[PDB]
Design a protein around this ligand. Structure first.
Ligand SMILES: [Cl-]
Ligand SMILES: [Cl-]
Ligand SMILES: [Cl-]
Ligand SMILES: [Cl-]
Length: 78
């Protein structure tokens, strides 16, 4: 139930959905900066499973899950 295994599940689900992780990494960085992500329907649905308030409220860079996801995307892209 920890943030790290949850972030890993996000990455897993993004790959399943056909996402380009390099692109998601860039998008997500910008999202944390306050810029909407341009996602496929499938990619949006993954994000909504884990960041339910994202559309009206954005994503908080200080949240444990956002931190874990940024870490996971960086490691996967490296
Ligand atoms: Cl940058
Ligand atoms: Cl749908
Ligand atoms: Cl949320
Ligand atoms: Cl938190």
């Amino acid at each position: 139930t920890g943030a790290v295994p949850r972030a890993n599940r996000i990455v897993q689900q993004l790959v399943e959905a056909g996402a380009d992780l390099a692109n998601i990494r860039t998008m997500f960085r910008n999202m944390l900066r306050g810029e909407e992500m341009i996602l496929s329907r499938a990619e949006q649905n993954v994000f909504l499973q884990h960041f339910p308030d994202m559309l009206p409220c954005g994503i908080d860079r200080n949240s444990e899950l956002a931190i874990a996801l940024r870490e996971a995307l960086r490691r996967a892209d490296s």
